[PDB]
Amino acid sequence: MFDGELIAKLVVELNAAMTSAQEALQFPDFEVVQKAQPTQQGTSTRPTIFFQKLFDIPRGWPATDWHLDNTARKYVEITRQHVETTFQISSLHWQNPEITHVVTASDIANYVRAYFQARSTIERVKELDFLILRVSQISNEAFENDNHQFEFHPSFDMVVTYNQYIRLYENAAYSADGVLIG
Amino acid sequence: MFDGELIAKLVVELNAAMTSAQEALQFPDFEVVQKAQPTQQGTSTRPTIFFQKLFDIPRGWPATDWHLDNTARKYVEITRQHVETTFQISSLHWQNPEITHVVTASDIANYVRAYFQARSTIERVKELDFLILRVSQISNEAFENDNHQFEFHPSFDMVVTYNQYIRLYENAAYSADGVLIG
Amino acid sequence: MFDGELIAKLVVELNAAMTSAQEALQFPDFEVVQKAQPTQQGTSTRPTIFFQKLFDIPRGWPATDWHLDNTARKYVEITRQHVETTFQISSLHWQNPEITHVVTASDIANYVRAYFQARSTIERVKELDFLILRVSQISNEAFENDNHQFEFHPSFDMVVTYNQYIRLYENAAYSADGVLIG
Amino acid sequence: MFDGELIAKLVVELNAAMTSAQEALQFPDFEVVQKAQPTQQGTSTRPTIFFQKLFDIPRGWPATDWHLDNTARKYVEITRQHVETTFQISSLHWQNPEITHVVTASDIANYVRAYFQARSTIERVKELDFLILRVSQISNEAFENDNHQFEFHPSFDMVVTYNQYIRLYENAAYSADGVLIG
Amino acid sequence: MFDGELIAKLVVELNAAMTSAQEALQFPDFEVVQKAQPTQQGTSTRPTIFFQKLFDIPRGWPATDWHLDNTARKYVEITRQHVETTFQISSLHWQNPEITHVVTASDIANYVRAYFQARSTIERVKELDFLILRVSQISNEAFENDNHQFEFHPSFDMVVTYNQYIRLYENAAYSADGVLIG
Amino acid sequence: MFDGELIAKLVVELNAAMTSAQEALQFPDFEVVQKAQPTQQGTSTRPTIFFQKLFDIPRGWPATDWHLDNTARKYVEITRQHVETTFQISSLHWQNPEITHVVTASDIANYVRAYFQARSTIERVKELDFLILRVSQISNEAFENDNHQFEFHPSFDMVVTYNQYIRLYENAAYSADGVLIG
Predict the structure, then answer these.
(1) Contact B157, B86 (CB under 8 A)
(2) Inter-chain CB proximity D110 and F39 less than 8 Å
């Protein structure tokens, strides 16, 4: 389907997941942004979710099927490749130490991970022409932020499988003949 | 169960472990603190315990069970995931060579590890909805320290397993019909 | 077949693939350039494709056949080696956020890869005296660009197999004789 | 036993081994020094031996034993663990090149290692509640002293196994009853 | 058979190979030099080939033979070891983009490698008391060059097997005596 | 114990090997020198041999045998350990391009290696209470010398096995008695 359609669908799904998480855990507000912005921009203080695409795998020999155009007397050769892409998803949130109600960035990451692994969401995204494999690890990494202090940047990887289509032209034959020799 | 409840329970358990270890080995005093403080802080010159969260393991396919709400004619889908989290426990203590009564930081770390591996503590913590696996190594590391005096920072990691719950909605059907052809 | 002819054939094939991709996805314009420019150059602000040559495997023991020159009474020894050359192909394209029609550099790389894996292109290139093996991965890498805005540099590896020929001289014999001893 | 008793003992047998080695090879004098001083130090220009604790291995599931206190009607739960507590031994000596009688630092390290591997020393140590495993390697490393006079620093690792004890309380029951239904 | 004659024979063979390659591919001129310049030198701006020895493998237990000197009543013990040595062959050539006739440094490296693998070359070499094993890889590497212009430095490894001889003396016996007891 | 004597014997053997090599290959003159000099010293221009001791391996459980002292009524417990020592041998020689008679540093290293692997030298060394195992590699490395004049530093490893002894005291018993019960 190529990137743009997949990215748009993933953004919509992430927005829905973040809305569900906000109702579930009661954190103030959220944003969904892509990690590598093509223009000089600044981070947002709101609880944020990030995504990025990193490497790709073709997964299998290409499959070709032939469709015939009668008017022009040509075969249209369609080749389909079943591709797998891995997306990195990470979140960010700063912990105010004098608020009695506590929600962690790891909690947001875990909830977003669990939402995408549910069977209902898989059933819903099936009609969006892609499925999701299993997620096996979520890690907490600590850095020193920009205001100094300390902060966590949890992250995990997701795999999305879909189909890629290309179109080409080929000649067609309409009769056969031979010779027999003894 | 997520993080806040888990962290609070672990803090209470660590406080109890130090309460025991103080009569066990005759410390001056103790404190339990978390690593990665969100605010700038200074360390304390007393026997101290530090803990931190490293990563998570989903450990198995999600399990879904269905509960029916009769009034609104809806199924509420409950999905449970059995997660494993690794916490890194470390201690700090400075050795005064003049005192004749000697207690080591590695000694405190060993006692804390032994406390969590006892059968009685596991039986008591079972009602707190998580359990502990085995601990396989404790390591001593030496650093220069701010006062240019060599010091030890023993550490080990611990694993606790629990359940995470998410909640969603789904439609319900109340009748069936079909057609038979031959 | 040595490197230069292979490079020319690869260049014309890449130009054809780029024309097909432009008709497929509506690029502004394209360009095919080699990476390691001998003379100093400055790169172009267009959707471009890059290729480079790296590694070389001989793949098998050499095979020799003999052709006889009657006039000079000499054997001409021809030795053929079936070579496997690896090419790395990468692309560049800067995403402009405000335009609604979106095409990514990874899309260009994916289409170029898919073109070279099609069966019709293999049939066309066979009469050009080389064939292509399977491609197994594509990777996205993010760098900082000469402007201080982020960018992506997708890449993948391609394998091309062909034959190499060398000619040498050797003496010839025209009669035999022996002695029998008992 | 915890660190203090073990370290004091190891010091005592280290002094005994050094005395035996001095009678064996006619050293000037010797010292036994730990390789982590909490206070600033300066090291000594003498044939010295160094030791330090590296890490720990719990080595097996804990074993619990129950001892009953009749007066208070309580069980005292004793838990025993059997650890390994690897140590690192290293020596230092400067080789004066114009003395006929020659002894190397590697000689000191080898003799100290051989002393601890003898069966008589093992039998004597056994009454001190720990035992020694096998030693597999000794290595020479070249320093540069203090911007002069290249020097050698031999080292090797040693393992001493023992038991660790912890005590806890638990309730006790004195009678049983039941109900039979069919 | 030690290094000096090895290098002499190798440079003669490389000169012959380059004379053949010049006819085959029409270089302007060539030159063979070593990468072990004992004196400061400055390289040449001509198609150049380089060689150097990396290491050595003994390849087998030594084989001893005994030859008797009657006049001096001594055995001369000859020991032979079948040595394998590794040489690195690499080439340099700068690409002028304006010339229409194109030849690559990779082409020169490939031709030189192919020349040494031919049957006729091995037959010629055999009477020079060494042989060549199989070559398995050639790699292109790009560097900045002293004119700030990219260029390639292809290289590959070759293996040469030969024999080494040393001679020593040993006593000789000429009679035997015995005693029989029961 | 038993190291300085080993170095003295090894130095004598190396001097003999260099005498043989000088007669065999016509060196100007030679020197045998140990690395890691305990005093600030300078390298010599003459063809030189450098040796060093790297590490030791105990190779087997210790073996104890008992010798009885009748006068003092004590057992003298002798423990023997059969260790292996790894020595690194390297040579240095600067090539003069204008002299027609050529000898390489690798030739010196190879001749020294071959001398120690001969059966005659092993038989002669057997009376000196140690033996040599097999040598499996010799490598060339390039230094930079005096800011230019690249140079080679060939090296290889040798293994020497021997026995080392320790002596200790133990009590003795002279009679036995028992009790039989039923």
Answers:
(1) yes
(2) no
The two beta strands, D155-170 and D74-83, are: antiparallel
Share of chain D residues as helix, strand and coil, in percent rounded to the nearest 5: 25, 35, 40
Phi, psi angle pair for B132, to nearest 5°? -125, 140
Q: What is the chain F residue with the closest CA to E169? A: F120
* Spatial distance between the Cα atoms of B154 and F121, rounded to a whole number of angstroms: 54
As a residue count, chain A comes to 182
**DSSP3 helix / strand / coil % (chain F, rounded to 5):** 25, 35, 40
- Tokens standing for residue B12: 């209470």
Residues in chain D within 8 Å Cβ distance of B103: 4
Chain E interface includes C41 (CB < 8 A): no
Collapsing DSSP states into helix, strand and coil, what is residue A39? coil
A-facing residues of C in 137-166 (CB < 8 A) are 137-140, 142, 148-152
CA distance A109 to A47: 11
How many Cβ atoms sit within 10 Å of the Cβ of residue C77? 17
Measured CA to CA in angstroms, residue C132 lies from A168, B82, C126, D128, E137 at distances of: 18, 47, 9, 73, 19
- Which residue's structure tokens are 């692994």? A117
Instruction: Report the residue numbers after which chain A has a gap, meaning the C atom sits over 2.5 angstroms from the next written residue's N, or none.
Output: none
Cβ within 8 Å of residue F13, ≥6 positions away: F116, F121, F125
Q: State the Cα–Cα distance between residues A129 and A122, nearest whole angstrom.
A: 11
| CA C108 to each of CA A2, C136, D132, D170: distance values in angstroms, whole numbers, following the listed order | 9, 17, 66, 70
| E24 and chain C in contact, CB less than 8 A | yes
C-alpha to C-alpha distance for D175 and C110, rounded to whole angstroms: 77
CA distance D98 to F120: 35
Q: Residue C45: which residues within 8 A CB-CB, separation 6 or more?
A: C94
Rounded distance between C-alpha atoms, residue C159 and residue F59, angstroms: 51
Task: Report the 10 Å Cβ neighbour count for B4.
Answer: 14
Give the β-pairing of F138-139 and F131-132: unpaired
Residues in chain C: 182
User: Which of F51, F106, F151 lies closest to E55 in space, CA to CA?
Assistant: F106
Chains that touch E (3 or more CB pairs under 8 A): C, F
From the number of C-beta atoms within 10 Å of its C-beta (0-12, 13-18, 19+), residue C36 rates as middle
Q: In angstroms, what is the C-alpha Rg of chain B?
A: 24
List beta partners, residue D90: D50, D155
Nearest to E156 by CA among E99, E97, E102, E113: E113
Name the residue among C47, C33, C15, C64 with its Cα closest to residue C152: C47
d(CA B5, CA F111): 74
Closest CA to D113 of D138, D84, D87, D93: D138
Strands B48-57 and B31-34: parallel
**Closest-CA residue to C114 (of C132, C140, C101):** C132
Check the CA dihedral B32-B34-B40-B46 and report its sign: positive
Chain C hits for A81, Cβ within 8 Å:
114, 117
Read off the tokens for F15: 């001097």
Torsion sign across C-alpha atoms D106, D108, D111, D114: negative
**CB E38: neighbour CB atoms within 10 A?**
17
Closest-CA residue to C65 (of C156, C161, C163) = C163
**Cα D93 to Cα D96: distance, rounded to the nearest angstrom:** 10
Query: Tokens at residue B103, please?
Result: 């207690």
Any E CB within 8 A of F176 CB: no
Residue of chain E with shortest Cα separation from F104: E3
